[PDB]
């Protein structure tokens, strides 16, 4: 449950047990939980992103979309459980939703490799983006994964090609694609479904070309000194926006998305609607050109 | 000038590892082969015209060391080196990684330069070949490095709908980011003998399943049997072979050996 | 009129297996459901308009028995039955196999009629749904049967480049020829609960590896885990679900439950 | 070596051991081997098709094509050895060659499942037909397989979908496709690469929707009575041609293709050249239309 430094907020949760009007001392609860979050360090942020009570793909699927039919398999090997995808409506408008599904409990986490997919997962992810296009449908993805599952079968089964083939095929997609990092944007295993027209990122989510711990123990010969790496690379929401890297930063409730998923859904569901509409004034031809263009610009050369 | 072999020890005269293209004549073991040299050993004579040379990096994040770790031991801008030219009188673009440069790490310049090769090969309307050697993306440029994957791969897409043959040559080693991007999106994926190719390094991979990694795991010979590679061509033969294949894909007349 | 259940024995009143669509209410076990009836239980009311009814077989090879094994126990032309119509006011073609007819064996008529459904759904410009149940291709028509695969699959191709949704519903059982053709080329592959689907029958498959066949092997639940099936929908729910999905693929308004 | 009823021809081979001019008694050898083959029964034919000394894919590859580079793998699982494919020239003209490779010896046969491919083989087969198209290249396939490998992994890996997906994709192929049954045209596992514009069949090769033995033990409750099935279904070369099923019947040397592969190559290599040229007077648009048309006609309805 409750994160680390949220302790005093957790302790202040001792209100339910409770003149009789003092019940509104929680005004101070609202503060504190306000000042505590005002000065959070890079490393501290990634912890919220990885927060144990943070909403996952399916949560928003149930909180913001209706008539969601989850499609399974890649047609050739299996149905990766680290990837959730299917056809649903977004205020009537059918959409193709694809995302990393971690899992609250340690058991679900196991059943879904903590959201790290195997090559057969990206192959499924793409099959769906492809079905979207086929039926002039929009594609909405939710990124939240520690990264692509590193393993033997993964390699033996083309974890590289799988990812690559997606980066290629996604760019040529002929419909709008809004990508939101709702949690942990890990490596290219996250990028394998992050090549979109609009690329929003929630206030406390992160994104990096490698996990902090790794980068840490590689350029600092120290594991624990990961926080140092986190602030070095620039894995935080704004740190990125200041570089044309992400389009918009969707904000979370007071003290984190976990503190109120129904409001977070609101904010997000809204943002999607925004992008997914100021994008229909574009012709397929233009859309793709816009994307390709935005794609070549990434970087400084 | 008498160098020793990596895995064999057979002393060898430098001038020898020349017409034998940095390859062990007694062990056939392929060795470190310069990025600018490779391009030479491929493209014909004189035809070499460098592209994207007017491209140099810069630290935009103020990383640890960075500006200092970033040119005296390679006399090059970035890990990749694009070069226009010809193969047996055939117009063809090329590009190769300098694994000496930090690890042939992909980042900004690497991606830009690559894109060039594609842009060049696109209007010229000619084949593209890329020799790959890297250990991942340049962490020093963070998400900028990452994005390169999506870009280089996005361009390769134009290349393909155009009908132009792109051959990726994976050389020991090609891992992570590049491995999982344009380095695996070739029309023909060709690996040099006993190469080490994969997405995750054996290192991390190992300390995961916490066991023994299968024999050969991630070597040209292993991969070719998991169908990730079209074929495994030796270096000396590489030149003509590339021309041979490419020649057929392009409908042009077979090169004159 | 009091029938017994296949795998359960729970006696049941015929009129009951009606609003429960030939399904066991105590075991949920789906049972033999007529080709003409299915089409009814799907398409709305009255809208049913049969297609390719002006199609009847014929022995062109003089096979053993043949002309005699080939209509009194099904009152139908061939294993497949195409039918135009609507789903929740949505124009949509349908088609279903009569496993009672020799085994829903695919052959000439079966392929022709199917193609019809595609032709019809093509100009009308509406979705196509097909319920499949077969044991292979009609040997009695030899290579004619085989070719059907290449044809039906070739047509389905037009269907797709047109952008029209085709949903294949694999029902117990769907094997060999059909299984390995249009019965697996659906935009959405949907299998009824505990169905038996595969290319080779367990029979032959077994006497090959000469061992024990894994548990579940070839059942909706097995397949769905090998990613060969998009989802497994129960019969009663099938009607609306199909409309639900189809409705989204077609951008039309959701059906009114 | 030598087949069954070829015995007297085998016995007559006792000439090498051998007036001195009698060495031309082999005029009678040429006959006999002429009369023996003149009246061969359906079942007898299938035996030649399955003949142990019959030329396989690679044989023609080496006998009629040059500059043959064999491509490997499907990019996702493995490199099926029951399928051979690659880029070569046919009198200068580059072509994409794909075919079933059985193998002379019992060891090679094992290494290549007696030419029965696994779903990963058709996936490779298609990847190559696709590379052909991409580079405005012709596709030439050689059919010779007992059928698609029936197994657990085969099923678990989509033997059905694999085959189907090919029948679909092959029809839409935008280049000429000449298909020749050089041996045993077995089921849809052979059909998985037999959807062509021109579909020739060698004089002694066969083709069926199911093997005789099977069909036998299914509609005759008898295995051995397969020959009966063979004549029933119509698995022989002409038996088919008499039904617009195959385009042309390429003839074999005197007494079988095994009796002289260099001549068979000649005949075949010729036939290909024929079709593969009276097909270039067609526009892609027309080509495909021609094919689709020829495809709908199969059958009698
Ligand atoms: Zn050596
Ligand atoms: Zn029951």
Which chains are within 8 Å of B by 3+ CB pairs?
A, D
Chain D closest-CA separation from residue C70 CA (Å): 14
Pairing of strands D93-100, D139-145: parallel
Chain D closest-CA separation from residue C149 CA (Å): 7
Q: After which residues do gaps appear in chain A, with C to N over 2.5 Å?
A: 18
Is the domain spanning A1-301 CATH 3.90.226.10? The answer is yes
Select the CATH number that applies to the domain covering C1-257 from these four: 3.40.50.80, 3.90.226.10, 1.20.58.190, 3.40.50.10800: 3.90.226.10
DSSP H or E run through B189: strand B188-191
- Report yes or no: D148 and D134 within 8 Å, Cβ to Cβ: no
3-state secondary structure chain D: CCCCCCHHHHHCCCCCCCCCHHHHCHHHHHCCCCHHHHCCCHHHHHHHHCCCCCCCHHHHHHHHCEEEEECCCCCCCCCCCCEEEEEEEECCEEEEEEEECCCCCCCHHHHCHHHCCCHHHHHHHHHHHHHHHHCCCCEEEEEEECCCCCCHHHHHCCHHHHHHHHHHHHHCCCCCEEEEEEEEEEHHHHHCCCCCCEEEECCCCEEECCCHHHHHHHHCCCCCCHHHHHHHHCCCHHHHHCCCCCCCCCCCCCCCHHHCHHHHHHHHHHHHHHHCCCCCCCCHHHHHHHHHHHHHHCCCC
Collapse the DSSP code of B149 into the 3-class scheme (helix H, G, I; strand E, B; otherwise coil) and give the result.
helix
- Torsion from C-alpha of B65, B66, B68, B73, nearest 10 degrees: 120
C-alpha D135/C-alpha C245 separation (Å) is: 38
- Report yes or no: A183 and A138 within 8 Å, Cβ to Cβ: no
C-alpha C257/C-alpha C36 separation (Å) is: 23
Cβ-Cβ contacts under 8 Å for C66 (sequence gap 6 or more): C59, C140
- State CA D51 to chain mean position distance: 13
For D135, which of B165, B227, B253 is closest by C-beta distance? B165
C-alpha D10/C-alpha D31 separation (Å) is: 13
C-alpha C39/C-alpha C83 separation (Å) is: 7
Chain C closest-CA separation from residue A250 CA (Å): 28
DSSP H or E run through C35: helix C35-42
C-alpha C180/C-alpha C162 separation (Å) is: 23
Question: Which of A175, A229, A240 shows the shortest CA–CA distance to A207?
Answer: A240
B126 labeled part of a ligand binding site: no
Q: Does B180 touch chain D (CB under 8 A)?
A: no
- Report yes or no: B124 and B132 within 8 Å, Cβ to Cβ: no
Q: What's the N-to-C CA distance of chain C in angstroms? A: 32
Q: What angle do CA D287, D290, D291 make, to 5 degrees?
A: 90
- State CA B145 to chain mean position distance: 17
For C208, which of D151, D169, D296 is closest by C-beta distance? D151
Which of A72, A77, A152 would you mutate first to test chain D, the one with the most D CBs within 10 A? Answer: A77
Collapse the DSSP code of C70 into the 3-class scheme (helix H, G, I; strand E, B; otherwise coil) and give the result.
coil
Question: Which of B111, B106, B102 shows the shortest CA–CA distance to B82?
Answer: B111
Cα(C27) to ligand 2 centroid in Å equals: 4
C-alpha B130/C-alpha B137 separation (Å) is: 17
Which of A65, A67, A70, A73 would you mutate first to test chain C, the one with the most C CBs within 10 A? Answer: A73
C-alpha D84/C-alpha D65 separation (Å) is: 14
Cβ-Cβ contacts under 8 Å for D136 (sequence gap 6 or more): B163, B251, D175
Cβ-Cβ contacts under 8 Å for D7 (sequence gap 6 or more): none
Question: Which of D260, D258, D240, D256 shows the shortest CA–CA distance to D248?
Answer: D240
Cβ-Cβ contacts under 8 Å for C39 (sequence gap 6 or more): C48, C81, C83, C85, C94, C95, C96
| Interface present between C and D (3 or more CB pairs within 8 Å) | yes
C173: preceding bond cis by omega (within 30 degrees): yes
Token output for A134: 């086929």
- What was the resolution (in A) of this experimentally determined structure? 3.2
Cβ-Cβ contacts under 8 Å for C93 (sequence gap 6 or more): C51, C82, C83, C84, C85, C117, C120, C121, C124, C126, C127, C128, C129
Q: Which residue has the tokens 């062509």?
A: D196
Q: What's the N-to-C CA distance of chain B in angstroms? A: 32
- Report yes or no: A141 and A98 within 8 Å, Cβ to Cβ: yes
- Report yes or no: D125 and D169 within 8 Å, Cβ to Cβ: no
D254: preceding bond cis by omega (within 30 degrees): no
For C180, which of D160, D207, D208 is closest by C-beta distance? D160
Please report the DSSP string for C204-219 in residue order. Answer: HHHHHHTS---TTTTB
- Torsion from C-alpha of A108, A111, A113, A118, nearest 10 degrees: -140
C-alpha D301/C-alpha C171 separation (Å) is: 26
Q: What are phi and psi of B200, to 5 degrees?
A: -105, 145
Residues of chain D neighbouring C137 (CB-CB closer than 8 A): 209-210
Cα(A120) to ligand 2 centroid in Å equals: 37
Q: What are phi and psi of A165, to 5 degrees?
A: -50, -25
Token output for A66: 């209706």
C126 labeled part of a ligand binding site: no
Q: What are phi and psi of B141, to 5 degrees?
A: -115, 5
- Torsion from C-alpha of D267, D268, D270, D275, nearest 10 degrees: 140
Token output for B213: 């990694």
C-alpha D85/C-alpha B162 separation (Å) is: 24
Helix ranges restricted to H, B49-189: 109-124, 143-161, 176-179
C-alpha A226/C-alpha A238 separation (Å) is: 19
C-alpha B205/C-alpha B198 separation (Å) is: 10
3-state secondary structure chain A: CCCCCCHHHHHCCCCCCCCCHHHHCHHHHHCCCCHHHHCCCHHHHHHHHCCCCCCCHHHHHHHHCEEEEECCCCCCCCCCCCEEEEEEEECCEEEEEEEECCCCCCCHHHHCHHHCCCHHHHHHHHHHHHHHHHCCCCEEEEEEECCCCCCHHHHHCCHHHHHHHHHHHHHCCCCCEEEEEEEEEEHHHHHCCCCCCEEEECCCCEEECCCHHHHHHHHCCCCCCHHHHHHHHCCCHHHHHCCCCCCCCCCCCCCCHHHCHHHHHHHHHHHHHHHCCCCCCCCHHHHHHHHHHHHHHCCCC
Q: Rounded to a whole number, what is the largest CA-CA distance in chain C? A: 53
Q: What are phi and psi of A218, to 5 degrees?
A: -120, -40
- State CA B113 to chain mean position distance: 13
Token output for C54: 């002006």
Cα(C23) to ligand 2 centroid in Å equals: 8
- Report yes or no: A54 and A48 within 8 Å, Cβ to Cβ: yes
Collapse the DSSP code of B212 into the 3-class scheme (helix H, G, I; strand E, B; otherwise coil) and give the result.
coil
For B181, which of A150, A164, A170 is closest by C-beta distance? A164
Chain C closest-CA separation from residue A56 CA (Å): 22
Cβ-Cβ contacts under 8 Å for D58 (sequence gap 6 or more): D84, D101
- Please tell me which residue of chain D has the smallest CA distance to C209: D151
- Report yes or no: A71 and A86 within 8 Å, Cβ to Cβ: yes
DSSP H or E run through C156: helix C143-161
Cα(D173) to ligand 1 centroid in Å equals: 48
Q: What angle do CA D140, D141, D145 make, to 5 degrees?
A: 170
DSSP H or E run through B50: strand B49-50
Token output for D288: 């495909």
Q: What angle do CA C76, C81, C85 make, to 5 degrees?
A: 130
In DSSP terms, C134 is beta-bridged to: C174
C-alpha D249/C-alpha D241 separation (Å) is: 8
- C218 contacts D155? CB cut-off 8 A: yes
Domain boundaries, chain B: 1-257
DSSP H or E run through B188: strand B188-191
Cα(B230) to ligand 1 centroid in Å equals: 26
- Which one-letter DSSP state was computed for residue C5? -
Q: What angle do CA B155, B156, B162 make, to 5 degrees?
A: 100
Q: What angle do CA A139, A145, A147 make, to 5 degrees?
A: 110
- Report yes or no: D190 and D147 within 8 Å, Cβ to Cβ: yes
For C254, which of A67, A77, A79 is closest by C-beta distance? A67
Pairing of strands B90-91, A206-208: unpaired
A158, with CB counted inside 10 A (0-12, 13-18, 19+), is buried
Collapse the DSSP code of C180 into the 3-class scheme (helix H, G, I; strand E, B; otherwise coil) and give the result.
coil
- C181 contacts D155? CB cut-off 8 A: no
Collapse the DSSP code of B234 into the 3-class scheme (helix H, G, I; strand E, B; otherwise coil) and give the result.
coil
- Which one-letter DSSP state was computed for residue B136? S
Pairing of strands C128-134, C166-175: parallel
Cβ-Cβ contacts under 8 Å for A256 (sequence gap 6 or more): A3, A37, A48, A51, A54, A204
DSSP H or E run through B174: strand B166-175
Question: Which of D260, D199, D200, D206 shows the shortest CA–CA distance to D48?
Answer: D206
Q: What's the N-to-C CA distance of chain A in angstroms? A: 45
Residues of chain C neighbouring D163 (CB-CB closer than 8 A): 180-181, 199
Question: Which of B8, B42, B29 shows the shortest CA–CA distance to B172?
Answer: B29
């Amino acid at each position: 449950n409750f994160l680390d430094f949220e302790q005093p907020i957790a302790e202040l949760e001792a209100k339910i047990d409770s003149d009789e009007e003092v019940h509104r001392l929680r005004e101070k609860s609202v503060e504190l939980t306000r000042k505590i979050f005002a000065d959070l360090g890079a490393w501290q942020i990634a912890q919220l992103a990885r927060h144990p009570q943070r909403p996952y793909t399916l949560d928003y699927v149930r909180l913001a979309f209706d008539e969601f039919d989850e499609l399974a398999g890649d047609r050739a090997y299996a149905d990766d459980k680290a990837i959730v995808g299917g056809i649903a409506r977004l205020d009537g408008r059918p959409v193709m939703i694809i995302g990393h599904q971690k899992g609250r409990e340690t058991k679900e986490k196991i059943r879904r490799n903590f959201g790290m997919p195997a090559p057969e997962g990206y192959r499924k992810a793409l099959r769906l983006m492809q079905m979207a296009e086929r039926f002039k449908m929009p594609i909405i993805t939710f990124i939240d994964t520690p990264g692509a599952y590193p393993g033997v079968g993964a390699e033996e089964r083309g974890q590289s090609e799988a990812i690559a083939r997606n980066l290629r095929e996604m760019s040529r997609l002929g419909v709008p694609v809004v990508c939101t990092v709702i949690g942990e944007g890990g490596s290219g295993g996250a990028l394998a479904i992050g090549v979109g027209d609009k690329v929003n990122m929630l206030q406390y989510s992160t994104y990096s070309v490698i996990s902090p711990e790794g980068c840490a123990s590689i350029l600092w010969k120290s594991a624990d000194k990961a926080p140092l790496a986190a602030e070095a690379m620039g894995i935080i929401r704004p740190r990125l926006k200041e570089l044309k890297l992400i389009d918009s930063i969707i904000p979370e409730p007071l003290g984190g998305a976990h503190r109120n998923p129904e409001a977070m859904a609101a904010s997000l569901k809204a943002q999607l609607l925004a992008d997914l509409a100021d994008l229909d004034v574009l012709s397929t031809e233009d859309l793709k050109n816009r994307r390709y263009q935005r794609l070549m610009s990434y970087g400084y050369a | 000038v008498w160098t020793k072999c990596d895995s064999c020890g057979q002393v060898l005269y430098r001038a020898e590892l020349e017409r034998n293209l940095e390859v062990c004549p007694k062990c056939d073991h392929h060795m470190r082969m310069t990025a600018r040299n490779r391009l030479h050993s491929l493209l014909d004579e004189g035809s070499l015209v460098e592209l994207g040379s007017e491209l140099e990096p810069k630290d935009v994040l103020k990383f640890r060391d960075s500006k200092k770790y970033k040119q005296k031991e390679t006399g090059e801008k970035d890990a990749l080196v694009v070069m226009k030219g010809t193969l047996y009188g055939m117009p063809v673009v090329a590009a190769a990684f300098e694994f000496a440069f930090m690890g042939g790490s992909m980042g900004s310049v690497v991606g830009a330069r690559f894109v060039r090769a594609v842009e060049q090969a696109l209007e010229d309307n000619c084949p593209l070949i890329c020799f790959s050697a890297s250990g991942g993306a340049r962490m020093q440029e963070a998400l900028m490095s990452l994005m390169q994957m999506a870009k280089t791969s996005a361009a390769l897409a134009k290349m393909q709908e155009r009908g132009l043959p792109y051959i990726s040559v994976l050389t020991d080693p090609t891992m992570g980011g590049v491995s999982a991007s344009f380095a695996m999106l070739g029309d023909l994926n060709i690996a040099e003998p006993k190469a080490l190719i994969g997405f995750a390094g054996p290192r991390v991979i190992e300390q995961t399943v916490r066991e023994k990694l299968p024999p050969g795991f991630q070597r040209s010979e292993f991969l070719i049997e998991k169908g990730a590679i079209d074929m495994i061509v030796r270096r000396p033969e590489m030149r003509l072979k590339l021309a041979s294949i490419l020649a057929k894909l392009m409908n042009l007349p077979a090169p004159n050996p």
